[PDB]
């Protein structure tokens, strides 16, 4: 009746905890690492994007797999934004109109036109009118990505530009990142692996990934108003600690950068799902983990920075294995087992929370 396919690499990091949570949690189903010509059985086939089968997953309802289909509203950084801001329009009290960086796409082709591009991305001129936040000028292509604050600024930029590519992003940026005293000052970003499942409950995984940067941060003055010079000057000659394990974030912060996630995470869901625009199609028969980045600044503020599919799970050490095999663990026993119509597996002080539920 049942079988498993598992057509990802054996030199996969997720190889060996995929079998042992596979051979304890679903002892009586047959693990395969060939899809067999017909899906003629209920299967579940944990595969790499490329190795699964779309029209398979959304014709037969014997396969399971490990991705879902549409989903270009939220792993697409210039469609996530305007997910987000198509909900908060109808959404004021939502974490999302704080918790999230918002980006947006400019064709500058002079500076004595930069007036005109901000029209024809009118979500960006009220931005830089309303003088609340920091900005990054970002060329798509790599003349330096460079901060400013208001349309006087960028527009100083642009000048001083001309005394190249045309596209650029303007992305909000944080210049309060939460310095830690043991991180020797570097900042980092929040790696949380959030688990979709079927049509749709969303699970958030509590043992979450702090990404430290190489070097200590330093703020940006007028005098020198650039950051990530080295990769400017490459192209002209061609650390992960869990984020629990940082005792230097009180508890009760490391707490409520959790909160913030859980309701980020879950705010995100309800707008990519009910969004009148590009959505979010859940499939009953699909699964899928993501990796979802976060800023935090020096006030414990959490910031949606980006969603990225099929993230690398690869770590050195450990304590990272452990926290790879219980998140693949917690996978298997809550969202696998029930497309067996095997019941999901509880047990009491869970780090894999439920933070959304649709019932579709």
Known sequence: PAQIVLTIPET????????????????????????????????FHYGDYEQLDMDQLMSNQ?????????????????????????????????????????????????????????????????????????????????????????????????????????????????????????????????????????????FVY??????????????????????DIEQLACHLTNSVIEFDALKDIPSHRREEIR?????????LFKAAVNVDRLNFRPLKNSLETFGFDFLVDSDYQVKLLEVNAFPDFKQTGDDLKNLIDELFDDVVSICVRPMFNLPPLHHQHSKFVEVLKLKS
């Open 62 to 202: 014997l396969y399971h797999a490990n991705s879902y289909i549409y989903r270009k509203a939220i792993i697409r950084k210039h469609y996530l934004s305007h997910t987000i801001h198509s909900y908060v329009v109808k959404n004021r009290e939502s974490i999302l109109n704080r918790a999230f960086l918002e980006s947006f796409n400019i064709d500058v082709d002079y500076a004595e036109f930069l007036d005109d591009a901000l029209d024809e991305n009118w979500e960006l001129r009220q931005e830089l009118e309303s003088k609340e936040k920091w900005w990054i000028l970002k060329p798509s292509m790599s003349q330096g990505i460079r901060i400013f604050k208001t349309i006087e600024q960028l527009q100083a930029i642009f000048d001083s530009f001309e005394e190249q590519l045309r596209h650029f992003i303007v992305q909000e940026y944080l210049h309060n990142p939460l310095l830690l005293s043991e991180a020797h000052g570097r900042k980092f970003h929040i790696r949380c692996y959030v688990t979709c499942s079927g049509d749709l409950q969303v």
């Open 259 to 267: 909160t913030q996630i859980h309701e980020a995470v879950s705010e």
């Open 206 to 227: 509590d043992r979450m990934l702090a990404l430290f940067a190489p070097n200590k941060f330093v703020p940006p003055t007028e005098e020198y108003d650039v950051l």
């Open 12 to 43: 996969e990091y997720i190889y060996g905890p995929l079998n042992r949570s596979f051979r304890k949690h679903l002892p009586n189903v047959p693990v395969s690492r060939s899809l067999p010509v017909t899906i003629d059985k209920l299967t």
